[PDB]
Design a protein around this ligand. Structure first.
Ligand SMILES: COCC(CCO[C@H]1CC[C@@]2(C)C(=CC[C@H]3[C@@H]4C[C@@H]5O[C@]6(CC[C@@H](C)CO6)[C@@H](C)[C@@H]5[C@@]4(C)CC[C@@H]32)C1)COC
Ligand SMILES: COCC(CCO[C@H]1CC[C@@]2(C)C(=CC[C@H]3[C@@H]4C[C@@H]5O[C@]6(CC[C@@H](C)CO6)[C@@H](C)[C@@H]5[C@@]4(C)CC[C@@H]32)C1)COC
Ligand SMILES: *[C@@H]1O[C@H](CO)[C@@H](O[C@@H]2O[C@H](CO)[C@@H](O)[C@H](O)[C@H]2NC(C)=O)[C@H](O)[C@H]1NC(C)=O
Ligand code: NA
Lengths: 252, 258, 281, 67, 240, 34
């Protein structure tokens, strides 16, 4: 999914679980005037089923999906990194913004300009590439109107249905998370005297940014390259742009 | 609000206001029965539109005056409620006529005619006139007993419609593309079942299906006919006979009362 | 508090209002389903899944409620006629989900009628109507009265069908290039459905003339058969049913009137019995 | 007079540029009679608003004729 | 109302920081440092203001921390207006020729006037966390100490969600302008025209955002130090 | 569209079972009153 579009998918869909998770989660204690023993039982089963939802998502990852590129050396015509062939130089392709483009053989080609496309006519609602030289025979039926034969910009996906299972499982995990927050924060008030509740928020809030958010990116960053091993070693230099975010290792 | 409305009243229920309005309504209905020959309606078309605008103005008079007189008590009585609905139709078709071009393409437009029949509804007011002069109440007794019978008539009628509706749903589900001319649409399924319920040419649809589609419709249609014509309509007959029997016993005891 | 849970939840009135809402809705969503598999649009794609998920929502909700009645008693669950029939119906409505997830037999004529059974549920919805109960109980009780009359009718269908096979044999074994109703007396089943059609007084004269159009089949036996079936079967017997049902309504009136009389007489004895203790005091 | 208004229309049927079949420009001028013309909306409303103003005036005076 | 614009602010910034890294010739090393500036800024005030919120007026401190939101948000928008000359495709005329293509992508005069902005940006991130955090501490503390327990969660939830709803619209409202106009697909002018609409896109957005953080603070300053609502409840909870 | 539709259902069937709990603990509040 397009990185700009992919960012939207989480941004526009994690909130609807989150907002009611506090709203339904908070109102459970508020309406029932839940006790300290009651909330602890409330938090446990809240999280336990959530983890099995995360576990359910993990089971979903097992199912196979269409694969584009990363097909080891380009059909025997060049190796990973051949990518810098003649058609790279003429249309001035740059190894940082490369995107995958689909050929009519269902084979996924990266860097639409590297596809050898010496001409590109762009319509109002789509981007398309013409005279695509560095393409292989491909091109079984293809199509077009004002022009004949050409390859269409972006990735081609035929089996993205699993997506509705993924969010659906993602929503209910998110809701359970936001109704775990209220029980923990609600209890903190009870076991502290009224004059000392002012310093109560500061104690937990100090752990929020330092103990958690300072070591976290480094823990991600080390394991981010663990699945992004295949960095663009030819141009980018010191790990600026990867090409193989390991679709099996990152999931695990 | 107490003297103006009250004099509007005492002029409204007046024994001349009623006669004036009944004269108007009997004239409107004699025109409306004139207009159903095509030898007079086509000739006297130019005078009829004049007369009908006149009647629209008269009905404006009466309806507004009655509303101002009797508040929501006017809306209370259903005889008037009929008149108010007729009024609404009249004013709506008036404004629609003015917002269109009175030509052939509007004569043959279905909505023009549909708005015109509701004008026919004015003739219903004529019964009110016939009531004061008297119908002789010769059918007062039959009407009274029909009045007694209706509460259960409605119930059995809606039960048999429900049976109609379920069978129509299932027949649409099953027998498409086996004579689509009959029930290719849900509405024409429902009409086909309703017209079966009168038993006119009902074998024809069985034969028509058997010709090109298939005959599974025969047990469905036989069971349908059993339920509806054989056990439901006979219920209507039975309940009507029992109701008139009660009417007769009431009459016998009443005449022995004297 | 385990069975008590199901007992309690199955008792909430807003909960029951909701479930009857579900019955009304599945009835009216199966309607628009069969209408809207039309490829004359693409904006209809967005409502196809909405209606389908509503379908399976109401379906699985029926299963969860049935399991709720299991958890409640599990013992009288097989004694209430309505509840056990609903179990039957939901079972035979979830059978289509299996037959489609298997897809073994075919996508054929039996399959479609197994699906539509769902709407049947709404019958219970009308048990809540006040008079409908009266008309129906009286309707079932009267039907009980005329039990043997239907056995006479069955005998007479036997009679007329198996003699109409023999009366009209040269007619069904005919070669006249132009005929319409050459089938009605072909076999026994066709003969029985024909006897029903004649029982309903539809196209009797047309069929009779068709029979006459064969130079064989003397017009004095076909005529006698048809006319005697129409008189006896179609006018008398159809009228005896109406007579019987009017009689049963008269009966119901008689028992209601006598019980009103008994209650009034008991009340008169009370107004006579109440003065006794007043005087005895 | 009595009966619906009548009108006469002298209309011309020509064939000038439409036909490639022949050299003849058929120029038929003929008069048609049209009866059954319909009431004008202007004539229809002018009846209404000038009749309502009268019958309103009828009642209002006869309201004041009772006092 | 204080939280909503607070929620509205941060969600924009993450993308604003992120697009600043990619667009303005940065490395992925410095971007986290700008991100880190917001984090530690709350940490250096999550304790200090908590000790200071205990001793003084909660109402005064929040509006002040609401005030420093107003100073921060416009400040995070000054570099976009002042330094729209950082790296367009062809607007650095001194070194890129309008006819040469390799000239137009080299001679990186963008890395100066870049680190100058990062000082506007590291300041913009630090004033965010130093002032934002007391908003989420003192206000909820006022919810704790003045509102009964049986409805604090009803108020705890909405405060959390008012930060979430700004996480939505911080992306939703902001990106409709950052995401390219109806013309994604013209000649290379569009990268040189998309460039104008992001800096001006946030310079428009932060100008309105920051001023709101002022008017909301001004209303809280007018709110009483001695809350009449709690004083009625305090006497209710002082007795018995 | 089976997966798409199979998503919306699992969203709701999930939430419906959640509603079972909410009244249950609400009913656990008032059952001792009986
Ligand atoms: C003798 O005094 C009686 C009086 C009570 C009078 O009640 C009246 C209420 C309005 C009502 C129900 C009555 C008679 C004609 C009824 C109309 C006949 C038309 O029939 C319909 C339905 C059937 C269609 C075929 C034609 O249109 C309706 C649209 C029209 C109708 C049903 C509207 C309602 C009218 C009775 C009490 O006095 C003390
Ligand atoms: C004297 O006071 C009586 C009053 C109670 C009056 O009840 C009335 C209720 C409406 C009712 C049942 C009555 C008379 C005419 C009845 C109509 C005659 C028409 O007949 C039908 C059916 C038969 C058709 C042939 C013609 O249309 C119906 C559509 C029409 C009708 C049955 C609709 C219902 C009317 C009686 C109580 O006062 C204290
Ligand atoms: C590239 O595509 C263009 C059209 O998309 C092709 O156009 C031809 O270009 C040659 C130039 O050598 C002209 O002589 C032809 O007249 C053009 N054709 C038409 C129909 O106008 C061009 O052939 C493609 N490139 C190659 C190498 O085939
Ligand atoms: Na008939």
């Amino acid at each position: 999914i397009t990185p700009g579009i992919a960012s939207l998918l989480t941004g526009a869909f994690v909130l609807p679980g989150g907002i009611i998770g506090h709203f339904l989660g908070g109102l459970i204690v508020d309406r029932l005037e839940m006790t300290n023993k009651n909330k602890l039982k409330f938090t446990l089963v809240t999280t336990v089923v959530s983890v099995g939802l995360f576990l359910l998502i993990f089971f979903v990852e097992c199912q196979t999906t269409t694969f584009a590129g990363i097909n080891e050396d380009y059909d025997g015509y060049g190796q990973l990194g051949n990518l810098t062939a003649d058609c790279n130089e003429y249309c001035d392709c740059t190894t940082s913004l490369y995107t995958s483009i689909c050929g009519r053989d269902e084979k996924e080609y990266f860097s639409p300009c590297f596809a050898g496309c010496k001409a590109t006519k762009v319509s109002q609602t789509e981007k398309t590439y013409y005279n695509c030289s560095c393409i292989k025979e491909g091109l079984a039926a293809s199509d077009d109107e004002g022009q004949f034969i050409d390859a269409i910009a972006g990735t081609c996906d035929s089996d993205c249905l699993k997506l509705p299972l993924f969010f659906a499982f993602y929503f209910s995990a998110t809701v359970f998370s936001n109704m775990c927050s209220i029980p923990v924060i609600s209890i903190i008030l009870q076991s502290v005297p009224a004059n000392f509740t002012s310093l109560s928020l500061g104690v937990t809030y100090a752990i929020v940014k330092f103990v958690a958010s300072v070591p976290a990116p480094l823990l991600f960053r080390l394991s981010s390259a663990i699945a992004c091993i295949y960095w663009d070693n030819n141009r980018c230099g010191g790990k600026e742009r990867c090409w193989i975010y390991n679709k099996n290792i990152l999931v695990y | 609000l107490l003297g103006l409305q009250q004099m509007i009243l005492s002029l409204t229920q007046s024994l001349g206001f009623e006669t004036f309005i009944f004269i108007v309504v009997c004239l409107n209905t004699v025109i409306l029965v004139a207009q159903t020959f095509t030898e007079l309606e086509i000739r006297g078309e130019w005078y009829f539109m004049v007369l009908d605008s006149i009647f629209l103005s008269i009905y404006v008079l009466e309806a507004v005056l009655k509303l101002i007189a009797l508040g929501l008590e006017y809306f209370y009585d259903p005889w008037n409620n009929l008149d108010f609905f007729i009024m609404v139709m009249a004013v709506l078709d008036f404004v629609l006529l003015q917002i269109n071009s009175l030509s052939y393409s509007f004569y043959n437009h279905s909505l023009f005619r549909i708005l015109k029949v509701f004008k026919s509804m004015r003739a219903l007011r004529a019964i009110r006139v016939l009531r004061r002069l008297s119908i002789l109440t010769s059918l007062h007794e039959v009407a009274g007993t029909l009045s007694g019978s209706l509460p259960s008539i409605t119930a059995i009628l809606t039960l048999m419609f429900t049976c109609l509706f379920l069978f129509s749903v299932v027949l649409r589900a099953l027998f498409q593309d086996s004579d689509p001319k009959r029930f290719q649409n849900i509405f024409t399924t429902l009409f086909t079942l309703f017209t079966m319920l009168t038993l006119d040419d009902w074998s024809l649809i069985y034969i028509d299906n058997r010709a090109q589609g298939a005959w599974y419709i025969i047990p469905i249609l036989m069971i349908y006919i059993v339920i509806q014509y054989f056990i439901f309509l006979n219920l209507v007959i039975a309940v009507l006979v029992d109701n008139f029997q009660m009417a007769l016993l009431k009459g016998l005891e009443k005449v022995k009362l004297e | 508090p385990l069975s008590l849970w199901a007992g309690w939840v199955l008792d909430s009135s807003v909960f029951s209002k909701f479930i009857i809402s579900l019955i009304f809705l599945n009835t009216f969503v199966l309607m628009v389903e069969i209408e809207l598999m039309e490829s004359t649009n693409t904006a209809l794609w967005p409502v196809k899944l909405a209606l389908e998920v509503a379908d399976w929502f109401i379906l699985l909700s029926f299963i969860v409620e049935i399991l709720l009645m299991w958890l409640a008693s599990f013992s009288l669950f097989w004694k209430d006629a309505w509840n056990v029939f609903d179990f039957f119906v939901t079972l035979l409505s979830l059978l289509p989900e299996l037959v489609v997830l298997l897809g073994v037999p075919a996508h054929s004529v039996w399959l479609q009628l197994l699906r539509v059974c769902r709407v049947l549920r709404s019958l219970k919805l009308f048990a809540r109507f006040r008079q409908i109960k009266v008309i129906l109980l009286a309707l079932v009780r009267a039907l009980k009265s005329m039990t043997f009359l239907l056995m006479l009718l069955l005998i007479f269908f036997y009679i007329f069908a198996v003699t109409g096979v023999y009366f009209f044999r040269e007619y069904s074994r005919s070669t006249i290039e132009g005929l319409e109703y050459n089938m009605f007396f072909s076999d026994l089943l066709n003969s029985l459905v024909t006897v029903f059609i004649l029982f309903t007084l539809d196209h009797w004269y047309a069929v009779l003339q068709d029979i006459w159009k064969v130079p064989e089949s003397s017009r004095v036996f076909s005529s006698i058969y048809v006319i005697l079936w129409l008189l006896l079967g179609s006018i008398i017997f159809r009228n005896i049913i109406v007579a019987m049902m009017v009689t049963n309504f008269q009966n119901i009136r008689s028992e209601l009137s006598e019980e009103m009389s008994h209650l009034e007489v008991q009340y008169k004895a009370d107004m006579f019995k109440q003065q006794i203790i007043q005087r005895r005091q | 007079s009595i009966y619906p208004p009548e009108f006469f229309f002298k209309l011309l049927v020509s064939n000038r540029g439409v036909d490639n079949s022949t050299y003849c420009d058929y120029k038929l001028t003929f008069i048609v009679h049209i009866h059954g013309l319909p009431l004008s909306s202007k004539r229809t409303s002018f009846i209404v608003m000038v009749s309502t103003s009268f019958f309103i005036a009828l009642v209002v005076f006869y309201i004041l004729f009772c006092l | 109302a204080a939280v909503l614009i607070h929620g509205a602010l941060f969600a924009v910034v993450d993308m604003t920081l992120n697009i600043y890294q990619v667009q303005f010739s940065l490395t992925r090393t410095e971007w986290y440092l700008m991100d880190f500036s917001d984090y530690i800024a709350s940490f250096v005030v999550a304790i200090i203001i908590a000790h200071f919120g205990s001793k003084g007026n909660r109402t005064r401190w929040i509006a002040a921390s609401c005030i420093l939101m107003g100073l921060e948000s416009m400040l995070f928008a000054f570099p976009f207006f002042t330094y729209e000359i950082i790296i367009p495709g062809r607007q650095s005329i001194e070194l890129c020729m309008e006819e040469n293509e390799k000239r137009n992508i080299i001679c990186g005069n963008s890395v100066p006037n870049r680190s100058k902005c990062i000082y506007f940006h590291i300041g913009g991130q630090c004033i965010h966390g130093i002032a934002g955090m007391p908003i989420y501490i003192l206000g909820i503390t006022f919810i704790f100490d003045h509102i009964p327990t049986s409805s604090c969660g009803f108020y705890l939830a909405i405060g959390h969600s008012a930060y979430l709803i700004g996480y939505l619209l911080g992306m939703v409202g902001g990106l409709q302008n950052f995401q390219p106009p109806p013309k994604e697909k013209t000649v290379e002018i569009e990268p040189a025209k998309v460039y104008q609409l992001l800096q001006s896109g946030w310079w428009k957005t932060f100008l309105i955002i920051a001023a709101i953080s002022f008017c909301v603070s001004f209303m809280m300053v007018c709110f009483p130090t001695s809350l009449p609502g709690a004083h009625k409840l305090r006497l209710a909870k002082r007795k018995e | 569209s089976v997966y798409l539709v199979a998503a919306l259902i699992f969203v709701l069937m999930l939430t419906f079972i959640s509603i079972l709990v909410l009244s249950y603990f609400w009913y656990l509040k008032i059952y001792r009153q009986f």
